[PDB]
Structure formats: structure tokens, C-alpha cells
Design a protein around this ligand. Structure first.
Ligand SMILES: Nc1ncnc2c1ncn2[C@@H]1O[C@H](COP(=O)(O)OP(=O)(O)OP(=O)(O)O)[C@@H](O)[C@H]1O
Ligand SMILES: CNC(=O)c1cc(Cl)cc(C)c1NC(=O)c1cc(Br)nn1-c1ncccc1Cl
Ligand SMILES: Cn1c(=O)c2c(ncn2C)n(C)c1=O
Ligand SMILES: [Ca+2]
Ligand SMILES: [Zn+2]
Lengths: 281, 447, 146, 49
């Protein structure tokens, strides 16, 4: 409907969403400093999950130079301070599992029990140039102190991955949707360099597909690929049916019936991974 | 009975994940029993003719061949039960997918009537375990709500085998394992598995391996698996049947020319045909015509230089010029032309079949399989076709769109995803781009 | 260099340096490189020709063994189809070289015993190994050379 | 790939090459993301400091 999207664009929804982005950016750095405040922070991460899909459903059927995308980005540069705090939030807590996954920082700890002290891990993360000075005392203030000798890097890593998987995916989808729709913008080019890690981490999970409908206009459709679907896609029993299906279409298959054969190839592969998921150990 | 059942599904699942490993050992042991078979010997002496094995400084080879033959018949039988575990749910799924859309859309068994595949499929509509290996199970209520007003609905319900159609629909709205099995469905499902060409090849493989214990020389035909195993030597074997209609008439033409060459030789050149070099015992082959026609098609098409190589020279004055013209026009027709027609028919059939396997790879590497623009348009930017393949138009993302639409709810769809979902279930493919993909319509307004 | 120094041991070892004409000029190198350009497809056809001829020797070993006798002397009989490794070496040496099948080197089937089985046996052997499979191999190099 | 490991630790690596400051190109490029003492021991740079 073109009628509601111009009505929401001409209303005062933007100062509402700016103010909702302000209260979300400050509470998630306030509620991250305690372990009894986990229930409120998951309920908030599901709430900003609901707004960005509301923001993505506003951008449907958007022309490559339309006013909805430009009033979306000036809302983002009217509100630069808090959305940089939401993308710095999603960066420092996603980088740490790549940081704690290094061979150096597991070699810096020698405790058999695994409870590392606070001063040794602070000087370790200060040796790497990926994290900054005020960042690390924010991350140790967010961690469990436990007499300043037990940070437990394993539980602090997987704590905010599962509640922040869906929202960290969709703010990555909101940035890639607005970038390839309106190009040649420096302030959006400011936004992708500030959130590079949540795009490259979710690139094999994001699929971009285009359909053609609604008065002959092509649109780009964004969806999610789970880890189980792509792991069964790259197995030799699946690609051998893929190698013969490509052969029997361009050689003897028709022109109009080739997409009818493609969907018949697609539904067969949903089943042959379903009989494979049944026979998996 | 519960512990023996889970031990059965543990053995069937352990075997099916090693289906490629099991046939690798089935072919390695197939080549192993025919390598050792090369050392057989016949003798009049005991170890009538006997078949005894000969080996130098080894006496373990005869208990080995008795051990590998029982090991090959065992591993062949596990391969049959493995193919009867893994791919036979796949081969039913493509047939009850094609028929259930043949029943509901164009009406194959309700408005028209038919092929042996059309009448064999009549045994599966009246079983209640029709949709048991299919994702759609409400297919019979699709077609009764579609074609239940134009005809008598009691007749289409008796055609579709819907038990208590006026009572099960009201029951669904408001609210001895072998004896529970359907006997009409399993005789139907065991009928189409026998139609499958791979299983009759796998059934030929098992029935000859069990025949190999009767005579161990029967293990020879399993080394023809190399013709069907690799795709390289299968195009040589499939080229005979690719142009098999044109070949059987040329050998039919070569049969009637040689038979027309024997009748002229039977009436005028019969005193020449004599292969016997002994004067007292004369063997004139051109005395019965069925004897002589067998003689022409056995030496005449094999000699390479005509029929006159096996016959005496025409130095005598009687029929000296008739015969010297007779052999030349026989050599010119059956060997120079018609035998070069046949090798001229298979090798270009072998040549063209490999040319279509290479052009499938080349046109795939050039065109996009989804939209109708070649790789010459995407040459304006470097790595543009790989960006058009991996990111934008990838065949794996089109399935990944589909199974994402299966798992999520209908009330969770957006407008773009609910539009392609309604266009897919009525089976229309106008949502595909087919000639324009973000670089033809917005080409001036993106830089 | 290592064969030129080996040429002082035996002066007949200087023969292999005249294969330099195959690699020197680019004209005769495409003839030698055409064997390895399609060398994967050739080694399976000679692998296919090996198992067809071995399947043709096993049928000849069990039913047509009294026919195979190259000796023209009656008192000293040499029946080649008595050991199978002897006979399989005999088929791949004369059968792929004769051009007209295996029946050129064997006695004629004028006897009534197996008169129609043998006359069909040689024809389908001549049709497969020489007319097709040996024309497959020369059909594989010359277009690779082409 | 594994035979070429015997040439990084010699000081006569760039001796037949126009570029000879290649080891300081890659230490200024990848000397902050990893331990620089390990990449200097990998590159055979004698007395890198
Ligand atoms: N959706 C598509 N539209 C058009 N062409 C496509 C599409 N998907 C793939 N292709 C083309 O066909 C090729 C298919 O490659 P395929 O996966 O069959 O083998 P491959 O690329 O050799 O695999 P790998 O190198 O990963 O082993 C692509 O490289 C591309 O050239
Ligand atoms: C086409 N014949 C078969 O299907 C086949 C069927 C049965 Cl019952 C047994 C074997 C050994 C078969 N032969 C192969 O299965 C096979 C032959 C060759 Br040559 N290669 N090959 C193979 N291909 C892929 C994975 C593993 C293997 Cl072993
Ligand atoms: C489970 N499932 C399928 O397996 C399926 C399908 N359409 C095709 N297939 C294969 N739908 C709608 C479905 O719910
Ligand atoms: Ca919805
Ligand atoms: Zn495309």
C-alpha cells in the first residue's frame, strides 16, 4: 500500500523512532552491568527486533531513488549518537568470541580451572589493536567480577549471542537494504564502515534474491539461511543431483518449462535432505 | 521386540551412510576375483576335461576365491537393501508428485482417460495410504471441491477411495502391524520399483553374483560395470542406442545387398566357390543358398578387400570379364561405403554426444540459468558475472528462499513473501525476472 | 645429457636424440601432445577394450576351445586355448591387429558342432573391437590433433 | 607451497628480485594483528629491532 507509507512518512513517526533508538541504546549499556537483569534485556532485544522489521516493512517496493529511503537516512543522521552506540554494542560483543578464539589469549591463561583474573585479561586485550582503552573497562564492568579473579570468558561470550542473534542480523539487513537501494551517500558509507563486522559475519547467512512483480518492477528480497540448511546443501549426494539436473535442462529441456523443472528440482531437494535428516546420526 | 527393532534401524542406518564405500569394495572385490581367475587350466588328467587352478608356490588362492565369492554375494545383497532403503522413497515421491498434480490441475483420471504408466497407476487411488510419502495429504479434498459439482460426487468419491466421505469430513471438522498394512499399495509400490532402470541393473548384478557360485566364470560380466560406472565409457555404449534406428536399417540394407550378391553368384559363378585344397575331397560351398549366404556375410564383410580373396583367380577364359567386374562392385559397396557408413554413424554419434556434454558446461558458464542476458552485458564491471552468479542470481538461494517460506508461518509473511507464496501454490512462474536483474532498468540511476 | 654420456657405453644409445625433432619444431609437438591432451579418455577406452576382449576370451575358453590350434603338424599339437593367461595374451595380440576379427587365425566352422554359435561369435567380435573401439581410439586422437 | 618454506628464512631471499623491502611491507601490514616477534621469526629477519 502506497497510502500508509506516505502517511507514516508525513507523520511524526521519525521523532518517535529516534526517541526509541535513544532509550534502547542507553538501556542495553545500562542493563549489561548485572546478571539478574537478563530477562529485561532479552525482552528489549526482541522489542528492537520488532521495530527493525517494522522499519524493513516500510521499505518494501522502494524505488532506487525514492523519498522513503532518504527520510530514513536523515532520521539516522539526526540520531547519529545512539545508533553508533547500538552498532558499537553489536561489534564489541561479537568480536570477543573471535578475540577469545585466538591462540594467544588462551596461551596467556594457565589456570587449570579456567577462571582467569581481571588484570591479566585486561592487559591482553590492550595488546591487540582491535579494542580500545575505554572499551575494555566497559567489558570488565559488564562481566562478573567474582573478587576480581573469575571472569569466565566462556560464559560471558555465549551470554549475549543467542538474545542478540536476531537483532544483530536485522540491523545488518537494514544497513545492506538501504545501501544498495540508495547509493552515492557518504553518511550511509559512514554507516557500513562503522558496522563492518556484523555484515561479514552474517554474509553466508544472508541470502539476497530478486522477484519480479507489482507492475513489472524488480525488487530485492532479503531472507535468512539457517546453519542446518547450508550444511546439508554442500554434501556430495545433494550436488550430484544438482550436476545432472543442470545437464538435463540446458541440453533437452524447454524454455518455458525450465522454471517448472527448477521448482520440481527444488521440492525434490527439500525431501532428499529430509530423508537425510531422518537418517543422520 | 523393541530392542530387536532398534537394532534393525541401527544396522539399516549404518549401512546407508556407507553406501558409496560399500559399492567401492563391491567393485574392488569384483576386480579381485576376476584378476585371480586368469590362471585357470584345462587338462585331460585329473588334478573328460576338469577345471582346476594352477599357481606357482601358492596354495592359498583357491580358498581365497571361495572366500571372496561369498564376500561379494553378501556385499551385493547389502547394496540391494541399501538402495531399497535410501532411493526408493525418492522414486515414489516423484511419481505421486506428478500424478497428484495430474489429478487436480488438468484432471487425468476424472475428465479424460488414457501408456502402461497410466493404467498401472489406477491401483493407488483407492488406497488410504496414497499420500503417505508425500508432503500434501489433503489432495483428495482439493479435487472434490474442484470437480465435485460438474459430475456425480458419489462416483468421484468411489473413484478416489475416500472411505466415509460424508462422515470423515464431519469427524475431522468437529474433532497386527502387518495386518494394518495395505496390500494394494505395496503391490503397487513393488510394481514401479521394478519399472526403474537402475534397480533392474542392480537386480541383474545380484542375480549374476548368485549365479557365480554355480560357475565361477559367471563373474566375468561384473567387469562391464566400468562401462556404466564412469560417464566416459557410457557415452560409447549409449551412442549405439542413440542412433540405433539408423544403424539397424543399414545392416538391414547390407543384408539385402549381400543376399542380392549371393543370388548372382549362385546362378552364374557357382563353379568358382571351392575352399578345399584337396582334389579328391571337394567342398563346394555354393551348392545350397542358405549355406552360401552364411558364407558371404561371414567372410565378405570381414576380408576388407572383397569376396575374391577366398576364391580362385579368374585366369580362365570362361566368365573372365563378368567376374572381374563383379568383385570390384562388391568391394566398392559393402566395405568401402556401407561398412564406412556404420562406423560413419557411431563415431559422429559418439562425437556429437560429447559435444553436447561440453556445450552444457560452456553455456552454463556463459548464461545465467534464471534471467535472459548473456555474460557480455556484465563485462562493464570486473567480476560482474561472478557477482551476478554468487550474490544476486544463485540457484541455491532460490531453494533457500523456499524452505524459509516452508518453516515460517503464514501470519509472519511480509507482502513480498506472501505474494510469491500465493503465486507458487497455484504454480505460476511469472515472479522470475527472466531478462532484467537490477542492471537494465536502474542502470542510469545507479553508479 | 645423461643419455649422451651413456652413448659411450653403447653407441646405439645415440638413437633417442633423434626424438628431438618431435619436441624441437612445434609442428610435430602437437602430434605428441595430443596423446596427453586427451589421455584420460584414451586410457579408459583401452581399459574398456581390455575387459571386452577378456570377456571374449572366457566365452571362447569354455565353449570354443577345440577350435584354437595354430599348429599345422598333426603329431605335435599346440592348442593355445588351454591356459587362460596364455589365451588372453593371444587375443589382445592378434585380435586387435588382424583387422577382420579372430576367425582369420582359427579353422573354419564347416563342422556341424557349434556351426551357428561360432559364426555369430566372430562377427560380433569383429564389430566391437576393430570397427568401433579401435575407430574410437583413432577417432579420439585425430580430432584431438585436429 | 611447502617447498617454498625453505626460502623465507634466508637473508638472500630478494637477491634476484627488484623488490628487496618486501619483509618490511608485510610487517607494517600484518604486524599489529598478530605477534610481531613470531612473524619476524617466520620471515628470518635477523635483528629486526
Ligand atoms: N544462478 C546461476 N545463474 C547463472 N549461472 C550460474 C548460476 N549459478 C551458477 N552459475 C554458473 O555455473 C557455475 C556452477 O558451478 P558449480 O557449483 O557447478 O561448480 P564449480 O563452480 O566448479 O564448483 P567448485 O569450484 O566450488 O568446486 C558457476 O560457477 C557459474 O559460472
Ligand atoms: C553404475 N554401477 C553402479 O551403480 C553399481 C551398482 C552396483 Cl550394485 C555395484 C557397483 C559396484 C556399481 N558400480 C559403482 O557404483 C561404480 C562403478 C564404477 Br566404474 N564406479 N562406481 C562408483 N561410483 C560412485 C561411487 C562409488 C563407486 Cl564404486
Ligand atoms: C513440509 N513441506 C514440504 O516438504 C513441501 C511443501 N511444498 C513442497 N514441499 C516439498 N510444503 C508447503 C511443506 O509444508
Ligand atoms: Ca504477517
Ligand atoms: Zn541473473
Amino acid at each position: 500500500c502506497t497510502g500508509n507509507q506516505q502517511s507514516l512518512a508525513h507523520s511524526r513517526l521519525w521523532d518517535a523512532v529516534v526517541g526509541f533508538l535513544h532509550v534502547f541504546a542507553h538501556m542495553m549499556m545500562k542493563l549489561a552491568q548485572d546478571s539478574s537483569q537478563i530477562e529485561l534485556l532479552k525482552e528489549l532485544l526482541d522489542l528492537q527486533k520488532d521495530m527493525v522489521v517494522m522499519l524493513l516493512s516500510l521499505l518494501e517496493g522502494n524505488v532506487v531513488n525514492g523519498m522513503i529511503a532518504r527520510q530514513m537516512v536523515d532520521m539516522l543522521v539526526e540520531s547519529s549518537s545512539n545508533v553508533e552506540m547500538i552498532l558499537k554494542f553489536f561489534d564489541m560483543f561479537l568480536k570477543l568470541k573471535d578475540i577469545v578464539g585466538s591462540e594467544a589469549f588462551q596461551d596467556y591463561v594457565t589456570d587449570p580451572r579456567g577462571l582467569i583474573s581481571k588484570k591479566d585479561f585486561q592487559k591482553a586485550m590492550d595488546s591487540q589493536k582491535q579494542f580500545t582503552g575505554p572499551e575494555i573497562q566497559f567489558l570488565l564492568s559488564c562481566s562478573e567480577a567474582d573478587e576480581n579473579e573469575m571472569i569466565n570468558f566462556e560464559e560471558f561470550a555465549n551470554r549475549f549471542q543467542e538474545p542478540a542473534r536476531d537483532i544483530g542480523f536485522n540491523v545488518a539487513v537494514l544497513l545492506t537494504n538501504l545501501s544498495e537501494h540508495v547509493p552515492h551517500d557518504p553518511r550511509l558509507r559512514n554507516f557500513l564502515e562503522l558496522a563492518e563486522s556484523i555484515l561479514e559475519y552474517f554474509r553466508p547467512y544472508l541470502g539476497r534474491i530478486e522477484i519480479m512483480g507489482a507492475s513489472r518492477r524488480i525488487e530485492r528480497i532479503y531472507f535468512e539461511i539457517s546453519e542446518t540448511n547450508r550444511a546439508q546443501w554442500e554434501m556430495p549426494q545433494v550436488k550430484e543431483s544438482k550436476r545432472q539436473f543442470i545437464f538435463d535442462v540446458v541440453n533437452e529441456g524447454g524454455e518455458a518449462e525450465k522454471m517448472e523443472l527448477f521448482v520440481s528440482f527444488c521440492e525434490d531437494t527439500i525431501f532428499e535432505m529430509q530423508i537425510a535428516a531422518q537418517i543422520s546420526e | 521386540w523393541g530392542e530387536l527393532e532398534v537394532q534393525r534401524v541401527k544396522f539399516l542406518n549404518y549401512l546407508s551412510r556407507n553406501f558409496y564405500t560399500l559399492r567401492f569394495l563391491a567393485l574392488f572385490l569384483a576386480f579381485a576375483i576376476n584378476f585371480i581367475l586368469l590362471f585357470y587350466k584345462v587338462s585331460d588328467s585329473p588334478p573328460n576335461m576338469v577345471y582346476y587352478f594352477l599357481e606357482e608356490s601358492t596354495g592359498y588362492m583357491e580358498p581365497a576365491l571361495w572366500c571372496l565369492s561369498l564376500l561379494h554375494t553378501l556385499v551385493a545383497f547389502l547394496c540391494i537393501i541399501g538402495y531399497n532403503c535410501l532411493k526408493v522413497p525418492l522414486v515414489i515421491f516423484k511419481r505421486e508428485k506428478e500424478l497428484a498434480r495430474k489429478l487436480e490441475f488438468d484432471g487425468l483420471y476424472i475428465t479424460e482417460q488414457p501408456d502402461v504408466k497410466g493404467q498401472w497407476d489406477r491401483l493407488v487411488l483407492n488406497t488410504p495410504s496414497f499420500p503417505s510419502n508425500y508432503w500434501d495429504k489433503f489432495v483428495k479434498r482439493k479435487v472434490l471441491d474442484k470437480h465435485g459439482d460438474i459430475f456425480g460426487r458419489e462416483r468421484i468419491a468411489e473413484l478416489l477411495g475416500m472411505d466415509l466421505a460424508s462422515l470423515e469430513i464431519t469427524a475431522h471438522n468437529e474433532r497386527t502391524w502387518l495386518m494394518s498394512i495395505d496390500v494394494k499399495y505395496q503391490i503397487w509400490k513393488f510394481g514401479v520399483i521394478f519399472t526403474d532402470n537402475s534397480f533392474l541393473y542392480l537386480g541383474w548384478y545380484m542375480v549374476m553374483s548368485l549365479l557365480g557360485h554355480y560357475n565361477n566364470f559367471f563373474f566375468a560380466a561384473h567387469l562391464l560395470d566400468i562401462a556404466m560406472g564412469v560417464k566416459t565409457l557410457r557415452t560409447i555404449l549409449s551412442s549405439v542406442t542413440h542412433n540405433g534406428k539408423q544403424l539397424v536399417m543399414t545392416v538391414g540394407l547390407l543384408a539385402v545387398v549381400v543376399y542380392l550378391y549371393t543370388v548372382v553368384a549362385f546362378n552364374f559363378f557357382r563353379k568358382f566357390y571351392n575352399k578345399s585344397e584337396d582334389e579328391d575331397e571337394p567342398d563346394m560351398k555354393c551348392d545350397d543358398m542358405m549355406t552360401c549366404y552364411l558364407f558371404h556375410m561371414y567372410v565378405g564383410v570381414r576380408a576388407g578387400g572383397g569376396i575374391g580373396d577366398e576364391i580362385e583367380d579368374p585366369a580362365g577364359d570362361e566368365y573372365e570379364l563378368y567376374r572381374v567386374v563383379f568383385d570390384i562392385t562388391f568391394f566398392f559397396f559393402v566395405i568401402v561405403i556401407l561398412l564406412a557408413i556404420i562406423q560413419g554413424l557411431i563415431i559422429d554419434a559418439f562425437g556429437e554426444l560429447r559435444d553436447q556434454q561440453e556445450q552444457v558446461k560452456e553455456d552454463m558458464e556463459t548464461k545465467c540459468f534464471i534471467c535472459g542476458i548473456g555474460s557480455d552485458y556484465f563485462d562493464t564491471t570486473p567480476h560482474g558475472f561472478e557477482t551476478h552468479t554468487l550474490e544476486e542470481h544463485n540457484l541455491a538461494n532460490y531453494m533457500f528462499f523456499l524452505m524459509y517460506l516452508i518453516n515460517k508461518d503464514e501470519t509472519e509473511h511480509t507482502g513480498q513473501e506472501s505474494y510469491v507464496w500465493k503465486m507458487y501454490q497455484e504454480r505460476c512462474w511469472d515472479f522470475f525476472p527472466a531478462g532484467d536483474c537490477f542492471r537494465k532498468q536502474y542502470e542510469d540511476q545507479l553508479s
